[PDB]
Amino acid sequence: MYDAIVVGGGFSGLKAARDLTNAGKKVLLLEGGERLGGRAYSRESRNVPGLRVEIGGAYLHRKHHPRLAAELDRYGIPTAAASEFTSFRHRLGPTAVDQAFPIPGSEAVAVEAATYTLLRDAHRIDLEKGLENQDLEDLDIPLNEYVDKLDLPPVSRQFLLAWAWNMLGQPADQASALWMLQLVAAHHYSILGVVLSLDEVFSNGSADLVDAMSQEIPEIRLQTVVTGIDQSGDVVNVTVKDGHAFQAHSVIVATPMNTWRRIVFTPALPERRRSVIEEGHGGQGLKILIHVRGAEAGIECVGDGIFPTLYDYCEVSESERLLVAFTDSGSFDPTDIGAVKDAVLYYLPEVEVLGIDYHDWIADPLFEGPWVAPRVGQFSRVHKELGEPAGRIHFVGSDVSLEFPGYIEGALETAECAVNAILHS
Amino acid sequence: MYDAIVVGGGFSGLKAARDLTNAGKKVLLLEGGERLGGRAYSRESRNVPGLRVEIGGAYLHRKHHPRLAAELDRYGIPTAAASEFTSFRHRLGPTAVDQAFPIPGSEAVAVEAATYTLLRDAHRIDLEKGLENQDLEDLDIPLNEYVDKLDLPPVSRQFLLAWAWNMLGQPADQASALWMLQLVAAHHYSILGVVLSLDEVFSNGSADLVDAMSQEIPEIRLQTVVTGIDQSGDVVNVTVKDGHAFQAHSVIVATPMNTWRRIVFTPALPERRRSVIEEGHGGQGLKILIHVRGAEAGIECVGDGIFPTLYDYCEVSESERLLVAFTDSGSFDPTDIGAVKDAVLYYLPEVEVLGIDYHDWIADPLFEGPWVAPRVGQFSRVHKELGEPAGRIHFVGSDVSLEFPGYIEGALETAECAVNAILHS
Numbered sequence: 014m015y016d017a018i019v020v021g022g023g024f025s026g027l028k029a030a031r032d033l034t035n036a037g038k039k040v041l042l043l044e045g046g047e048r049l050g051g052r053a054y055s056r057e058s059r060n061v062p063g064l065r066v067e068i069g070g071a072y073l074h075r076k077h078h079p080r081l082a083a084e085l086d087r088y089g090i091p092t093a094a095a096s097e098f099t100s101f102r103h104r105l106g107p108t109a110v111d112q113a114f115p116i117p118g119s120e121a122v123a124v125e126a127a128t129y130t131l132l133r134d135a136h137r138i139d140l141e142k143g144l145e146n147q148d149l150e151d152l153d154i155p156l157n158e159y160v161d162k163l164d165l166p167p168v169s170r171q172f173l174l175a176w177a178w179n180m181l182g183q184p185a186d187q188a189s190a191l192w193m194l195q196l197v198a199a200h201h202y203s204i205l206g207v208v209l210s211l212d213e214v215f216s217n218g219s220a221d222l223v224d225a226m227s228q229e230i231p232e233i234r235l236q237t238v239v240t241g242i243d244q245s246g247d248v249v250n251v252t253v254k255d256g257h258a259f260q261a262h263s264v265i266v267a268t269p270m271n272t273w274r275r276i277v278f279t280p281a282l283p284e285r286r287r288s289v290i291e292e293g294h295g296g297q298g299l300k301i302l303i304h305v306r307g308a309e310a311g312i313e314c315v316g317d318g319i320f321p322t323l324y325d326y327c328e329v330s331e332s333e334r335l336l337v338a339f340t341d342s343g344s345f346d347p348t349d350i351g352a353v354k355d356a357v358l359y360y361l362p363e364v365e366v367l368g369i370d371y372h373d374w375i376a377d378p379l380f381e382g383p384w385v386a387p388r389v390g391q392f393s394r395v396h397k398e399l400g401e402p403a404g405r406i407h408f409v410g411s412d413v414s415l416e417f418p419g420y421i422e423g424a425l426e427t428a429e430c431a432v433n434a435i436l437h438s
Numbered sequence: 439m440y441d442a443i444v445v446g447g448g449f450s451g452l453k454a455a456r457d458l459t460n461a462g463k464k465v466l467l468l469e470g471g472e473r474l475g476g477r478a479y480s481r482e483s484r485n486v487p488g489l490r491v492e493i494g495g496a497y498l499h500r501k502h503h504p505r506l507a508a509e510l511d512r513y514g515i516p517t518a519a520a521s522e523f524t525s526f527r528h529r530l531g532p533t534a535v536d537q538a539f540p541i542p543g544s545e546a547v548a549v550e551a552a553t554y555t556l557l558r559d560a561h562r563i564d565l566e567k568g569l570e571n572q573d574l575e576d577l578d579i580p581l582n583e584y585v586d587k588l589d590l591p592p593v594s595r596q597f598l599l600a601w602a603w604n605m606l607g608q609p610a611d612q613a614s615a616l617w618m619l620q621l622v623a624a625h626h627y628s629i630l631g632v633v634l635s636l637d638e639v640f641s642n643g644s645a646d647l648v649d650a651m652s653q654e655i656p657e658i659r660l661q662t663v664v665t666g667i668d669q670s671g672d673v674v675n676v677t678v679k680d681g682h683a684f685q686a687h688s689v690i691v692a693t694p695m696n697t698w699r700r701i702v703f704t705p706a707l708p709e710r711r712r713s714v715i716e717e718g719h720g721g722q723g724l725k726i727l728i729h730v731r732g733a734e735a736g737i738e739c740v741g742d743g744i745f746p747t748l749y750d751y752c753e754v755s756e757s758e759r760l761l762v763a764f765t766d767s768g769s770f771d772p773t774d775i776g777a778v779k780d781a782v783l784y785y786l787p788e789v790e791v792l793g794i795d796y797h798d799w800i801a802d803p804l805f806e807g808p809w810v811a812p813r814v815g816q817f818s819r820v821h822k823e824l825g826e827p828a829g830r831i832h833f834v835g836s837d838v839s840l841e842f843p844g845y846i847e848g849a850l851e852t853a854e855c856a857v858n859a860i861l862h863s
């Protein structure tokens with residue numbers, strides 16, 4: 014038996030297992046898959062032999078992400094500025110200007126006023142209380158309705174919606190306006206900063222930091238899928254698909270929220286959590302790496318396309334690159350290459366699509382989704398509680414971070430909190 | 439004896455005398471000077487023979503100024519777009535960009551946050567209540583201190599200060615942050631709109647509208663300076679520098695606030711008004727028309743110069759123009775041509791100064807100031823009351839408008855209110 018079993022070897026599990034180990038606890042980490050890192054996944058390109066790509070979560074910003082910065086510094090992990098955009102190819106209508114902030118002067122007054130409203134609304138959110146504890150239900154409505162109320166002129170309207178579609182991984186009618194405001198709050202109450210935090214990347218992929226952390230974790234079992242967590246006895250019993258159980262005084266659930274429903278908890282989890290757990294969050298973000306020819310470096314495109322965003326990802330050769338597109342898997346089928354071409358050509362009619370690469374997070378039984386975003390009405394009902402302990406079982410991860418949900422920083426933050434709680438007892 | 443004596447033949451007096459006349463009242467208008475229009479003054483250039491210039495208040499915006507628009511439409515008075523700026527020559531430091539909104543991307547987040555603060559603060563102001571009636575005293579502090587608290591990076595810092603110096607006619611340490619916020623409030627709670635309302639000009643000078651209104655006023659006496667207003671008897675007695683008194687049931691004071699102290703009121707005005715009346719407002723705006731050679735059309739300059747603003751005013755010839763500079767008469771002496779050259783050359787080192795033209799509003803006994811701006815601490819003590827009747831004596835004018843102080847629209851608005859009040863009784 015162990016002091017702690019950690020379930021899941023994403024960044025959160027890795028942090029928690031390492032820091033409990035360095036505190037002198039006896040820890041076991043169980044990861045269901047054949048790799049560590051979770052929704053941070055670097056691997057070989059499907060399109061380009063020998064090419065290392067981030068298929069999951071690539072970007073960071075030192076200022077917004079101090080725990081991640083500290084990890085990078087601890088292990089001397091090299092980062093680089095994300096590809097600068099030097100060419101803008103928006104689809105926002107004839108008055109938009111082709112630069113990173115494409116709003117024309119004729120919209121300036123409207124943007125001013127909307128800026129006040131958006132930040133006013135976001136300033137209602139105290140990031141420590143939980144979205145269900147602040148009388149925020151009036152904001153917890155479909156984004157398209159909230160945006161219709163701002164009544165914005167065309168360029169800024171579509172610019173906001175496009176970026177919200179990219180960032181939330183939901184179309185406007187499925188996204189919560191409240192969750193959009195939570196992301197604003199999380200970035201030091203900044204609309205701009207939501208996009209500005211795409212600031213740096215791992216020079217060698219997020220695996221660099223995965224490997225550094227794992228090297229400090231003495232006991233890790235891969236291909237070990239947890240199926241039951243039973244705290245009915247004096248010591249927690251952890252049951253596993255094809256093997257003998259493991260026991261520990263404490264268990265950390267560091268798996269994705271949308272998989273918790275596949276674990277049997279004994280006794281059953283607090284009733285208020287159960288239906289959100291059963292339903293899952295609604296995020297459907299779909300990131301597609303597009304292998305292309307005929308694109309010059311430094312392109313960014315934002316617009317009204319089925320791809321709200323399409324931007325430079327990496328050089329492959331002198332004539333070839335990867336672009337990245339964001340959309341959502343409810344609205345777009347990435348295996349339909351014809352559809353991919355149409356979506357690309359919309360912005361960039363000179364560009365030839367060679368290939369696509371993505372991971373199906375939704376179909377992956379170890380995830381059942383990409384990054385977190387709640388369905389409308391979910392998080393103003395129950396939110397903070399999803400990341401709070403039930404007896405000796407802690408719940409951690411990006412999915413349940415109050416402070417930086419959906420980012421690596423949030424995986425670190427939630428782990429930090431579970432670790433401290435365990436150290437006190 | 440008359441139903442009403444109107445004192446002062448600026449726009450406010452003109453409106454009030456005309457509309458009381460058209461209502462069937464018997465009205466007399468007394469103007470101390472040799473001309474009508476007041477602080478709206480078109481005349482011949484001192485520098486350029488035969489050239490008609492606006493030496494006072496030139497600009498209007500139909501959307502912000504519906505009473506003025508209605509006057510223009512009533513009389514079919516032609517307006518034109520103000521000179522478009524096509525060339526930007528700012529002094530805001532090496533990161534500023536040379537366009538109308540000179541803020542660089544590296545300041546975007548700071549501007550976002552300041553935008554929220556400024557509009558939050560301005561949204562505390564209800565334009566109908568008076569600045570003294572809303573618990574606003576905490577904002578009624580020196581602008582430089584308020585701005586230091588926003589802690590803005592250099593370009594937006596200086597851009598804000600420069601425009602505030604231009605618009606208020608006071609240096610930052612004499613201006614009230616509260617009054618800056620009042621101008622924001624007045625423009626539909628818009629910082630941008632403060633500058634955007636410089637939108638159109640009278641094609642033939644503001645005299646066009648002065649003349650149209652005056653033609654409807656059957657009795658006007660020029661060179662008739664009022665010295666006393668005595669409502670001790672049943673009928674008001676109006677006493678005059680070199681002449682016999684005039685009598686009326688009602689008197690409208692439509693003279694500038696800083697001259698009211700030169701009139702003897704009987705009985706004395708309500709005590710709360712008296713000290714602001716004695717002291718006068720603090721506006722020192724100084725508009726200088728600069729005759730130049732070597733400037734191309736369409737220049738705007740905003741910066742840290744003794745002229746915060748310097749911009750195109752009119753074509754004189756193919757090689758010559760008028761520019762306009764705004765500063766304040768406490769900080770700058772316009773008759774020092776050497777100083778003018780230095781101030782111009784700062785922004786535009788290729789430009790030769792031929793001549794300057796201005797009106798000394800401060801020295802003019804019929805004004806004792808340019809447009810209104812309060813001293814720090816004045817208007818959170820007494821404001822709305824300055825424009826309220828004392829018995830049968832009404833007080834009107836731009837100076838005391840709650841809604842558009844310092845603009846023609848505010849002259850019209852205050853007159854409208856006195857007129858209605860008189861018509862009811």
Ligand SMILES: CC(=O)NC(=O)NCN(CC[C@H](C)[C@H](C)CCN)C[C@H](O)[C@H](O)[C@H](O)COP(=O)(O)OP(=O)(O)OC[C@H]1O[C@@H](n2cnc3c(N)ncnc32)[C@H](O)[C@@H]1O
Nearest residue numbers: 021023024025045051052069070071072239410411420421
């Ligand atoms: C994007 C960006 O640019 N920047 C970012 O900051 N973030 C990127 N991003 C999203 C990536 C997107 C999908 C998107 C397409 C790409 C974005 N670009 C947000 C952020 O990166 C992630 O949401 C974040 O790093 C989450 O970390 P944690 O919070 O630690 O959970 P997770 O990683 O999921 O590891 C769970 C482990 O449980 C294992 N497991 C499951 N069931 C199990 C069982 N029963 N038994 C045992 N093990 C089990 C399962 O095998 C797995 O190994």
Ligand SMILES: CC(=O)NC(=O)NCN(CC[C@H](C)[C@H](C)CCN)C[C@H](O)[C@H](O)[C@H](O)COP(=O)(O)OP(=O)(O)OC[C@H]1O[C@@H](n2cnc3c(N)ncnc32)[C@H](O)[C@@H]1O
Nearest residue numbers: 446448449450470476477494495496497664835836845846
């Ligand atoms: C600028 C802009 O672009 N746009 C603008 O909208 N506005 C421009 N602007 C300011 C112009 C600036 C100074 C600046 C340099 C230039 C701006 N650019 C604000 C706005 O234009 C003015 O502040 C506004 O139009 C004020 O109208 P009212 O409110 O009607 O007062 P006023 O006109 O002063 O007529 C008082 C009459 O009493 C007579 N009087 C005095 N004492 C007497 C006495 N005892 N007995 C009898 N008469 C007497 C005295 O002879 C005079 O005829």
Ligand SMILES: CN1CCC[C@@H]1c1ccc(O)nc1
Nearest residue numbers: 070179180211339384419420
């Ligand atoms: C909001 N996030 C967190 C995970 C994926 C993601 C993301 C990353 C880049 C981009 O352009 N948009 C969204």
Ligand SMILES: CN1CCC[C@@H]1c1ccc(O)nc1
Nearest residue numbers: 495604605636764809844845
């Ligand atoms: C604020 N006002 C009202 C009267 C003068 C004035 C003004 C006009 C133009 C400009 O650039 N700045 C100030």
